[PDB]
């Protein structure tokens, strides 16, 4: 379908060269997309749309929804139980939030853990070309998003806001990131199974 070709194009076209030279996510310019599955979880969808309507009413009738990537070793728990801020802690650049990227390759750096962890479970390789990885392409309600350049360890959204947008700066994020502090503000719409490809 064209819906899945659209997802594959967003996955491929948003790849960037990383500052760490591929340390966290592996060395690649493109992916081998194996499968794209649409997640249909009615209870999670309703939790998401209920919150989306509330945020829209608090943001000049505008949800400020975006399709963003999310990488995690816990993709299976997310598709069944949803995103959960109780699993977030203060240690990230913007604190105890749930993080998303507009660049698929940035989300790919988190699939095997923080900084890629020890890589794939079978080969302990962050640049594994063999093992199949999974990323989520998500509907995310940003609402009134607080723009920030430097570290600001939050527990919750800033007063009057619904999310934080980390913008690139000198010393300094290389790429944007989007952070929510309520799990119901994202819906894991597509589950993408893929491999990174050797350049
Ligand atoms: O796709 C993403 N997944 C999570 C991390 C992430 C980014 O932020 C790194 C911030 C460190 C704190 N995180 C929360 C708890 C454990 C994982 C790391 C930025 C953009 C996308 C993502
Ligand atoms: Zn492997």
Author numbering: 962 to 1160
From the primary publication:
Here, the high-resolution crystal structures of the human TNKS2 PARP domain in complex with 16 various PARP inhibitors are reported, including the compounds BSI-201, AZD-2281 and ABT-888, which are currently in Phase 2 or 3 clinical trials. Tankyrase enzymes are now appreciated to poly(ADP-ribosyl)ate (PARsylate) a number of target proteins which contain a common RXXPXG ARC-binding consensus sequence. While both TNKS1 and TNKS2 knockout mice are viable with a decreased body-weight phenotype, TNKS1/TNKS2 compound homozygote knockout mice are embryonically lethal by day 9.5, supporting genetic redundancy between the two proteins. Both TNKS and TNKS2 bind to and suppress Axin2, a negative regulator of β-catenin, suggesting that they may represent novel druggable targets for cancers dependent on active β-catenin. TNKS1 and TNKS2 also differ from other PARP family members in that they harbor a short zinc-binding motif containing residues Thr1079–His1093 within the catalytic domain.
